[PDB]
Amino acid sequence: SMNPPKYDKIEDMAMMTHLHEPAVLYNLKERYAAWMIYTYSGLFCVTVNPYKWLPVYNPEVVAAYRGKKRQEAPPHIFSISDNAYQFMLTDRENQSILITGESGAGKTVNTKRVIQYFATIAVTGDKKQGTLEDQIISANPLLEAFGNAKTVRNDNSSRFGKFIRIHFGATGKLASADIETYLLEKSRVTFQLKAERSYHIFYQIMSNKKPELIEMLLITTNPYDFAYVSQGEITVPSIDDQEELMATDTAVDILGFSADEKVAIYKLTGAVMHYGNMKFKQKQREEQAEPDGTEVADKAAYLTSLNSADLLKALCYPRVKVGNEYVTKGQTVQQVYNSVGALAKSMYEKMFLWMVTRINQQLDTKQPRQYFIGVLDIAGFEIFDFNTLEQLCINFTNEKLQQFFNHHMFVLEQEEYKKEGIDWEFIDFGMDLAACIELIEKPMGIFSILEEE
């Protein structure tokens, strides 16, 4: 039997007074039928895309007040920013605000609005060139294609690791920001199921529209050719990659960075998919894996400005030694196949990494930074009936994040014990669930022993 109308109209899951999930859920559902937006647990606010017009934004609340610490004001994400500021303002070491799941529309929309409220902070600090949200938008369409992915249960969902940083030489109006480099999932290039598709860049480019590139790419417009590419589902019916190509152009031109490099750059990816064709062969009385002599390799040579024979000898039976120098020969079929896939993947990785340098520099400023506030997109866990290790690993990372959540709360709550005179009868949640991770982790890692063996 359930927490009564007093409880029923409160702001807070955080101040629960009966614990079983349905309580929480229905009650927030009551908010939802009330359309009452902003929901609170932990010390913090929990969010739903309203799917409708409301001028939540309209400055009457937003500007006119900083607002209040948590209990004191109506729930709003605007709060969390607000008080994180005044907290840091005195505290003057950094804070980030962490935003979970929601992997499509509302996630990104609200991240936008988050930086919009950063603009409101700018207005609060001082007032008198892409707009700074619009500057992030400069990244968004290309980067969105760049690391989005398709889940059985999600259709544009992104399995890079991005992290967003914002940086202050200023406590004035606003000072400028980073978006940063974090766990990226190389294995997706390795494999797909026939229901499933590939890093969106590939899927996008590989559409038919741009007449010169396709042959300049040394490519057939057919995905079907590249088995290593082909592994997936052969289209998404109605995500229209002709226009999405045009958007990619729009961004890369908005780069203010050179055609020739950038074309060569995606061409690198073209080479990568060409590597899926590379396939080696094993001779009599001999274990080596050995060449198919292939126009593919010649395409590589052309694009690389290597010669193919250079590949053939120098890689396909390598040399490593230093202090004297010595040569490596006879790799297994598997050894070769894995090896080349690894190289390709690393190259894709590198390309992402490079994107940092100039993209940020376009963002980057001789306006100083002393101090930092940050954004993250995903503690990403999803379910499938069927599973593959990497996903589980990311889930591991998610729960790790929850370790971080838990032990910080553990400490803080102990401070609240202190607050009104009271003594701790509770032990680290961070440790407690960390034990659950510890089943995964000993100095032996589960992962460790797998890859090790």
Binding site: N3, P4, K6, Y7, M13, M16, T17, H18, L19, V24, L25, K29, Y32, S41, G42, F44, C45, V46, T47, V48, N49, Y51, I77, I80, F87, D91, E93, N94, Q95, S96, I97, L98, I99, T100, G101, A105, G106, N110, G161, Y182, L183, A264, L268, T357, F381, I383, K400, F404, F405, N406, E413, K419, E420, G421, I422, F426, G445, F447, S448, E451
Partner: protein, 152 residues
């Protein structure tokens, strides 16, 4: 001349998932410096629509969104603070007792008397220095008492 940025001891050709740990690990380390802040986010609906709730994935998302088992964790806390003045402004009823407002009675004293009629416990409640602390059930029973008594 992509290649220089193309190009540039812990391991070689190995440690690969552990490398992926490493990549996280540094991030975690640096985050440890920070104060974190938190938002968890939901499609309650079948869709992104004015159209209404779809429950079950919202269930599981909330399972995925720590608040649920976080609150599991916290309920042990008796994770609860309720302010003297409102609370007693409801609760005095059973004591049926007049001793003057202000600190002739603290809220603590008024509790010790009403509790003397009602309860002696740590787990159901303990004193806080300005605000008052309870098992989830307890407020529930408190007002259960209040309606039952006032109706009679």
């Amino acid at each position: 001349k992509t290649l220089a940025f193309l190009f540039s001891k812990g391991s070689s050709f190995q440690t690969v998932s552990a490398l992926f740990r490493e990549n996280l690990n540094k991030l975690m380390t640096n985050l440890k410096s920070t104060h974190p802040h938190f938002v968890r986010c939901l499609i309650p609906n079948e869709t992104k629509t004015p159209g209404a709730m779809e429950h079950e994935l919202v269930l599981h998302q909330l399972r995925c969104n720590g608040v649920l088992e976080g609150i599991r964790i916290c309920r042990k806390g008796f994770p609860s603070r309720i302010l003297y003045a409102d609370f007693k402004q409801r609760y005095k009823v059973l004591n049926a007792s007049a001793i003057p407002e202000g600190q002739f009675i603290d809220s603590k004293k008024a509790s010790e008397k009403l509790l003397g009629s009602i309860d002696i416990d740590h787990t159901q409640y303990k004193f806080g220095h300005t605000k008052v602390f309870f098992k989830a059930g307890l407020l529930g029973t408190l007002e259960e008492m209040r309606d039952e008594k006032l109706a009679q």
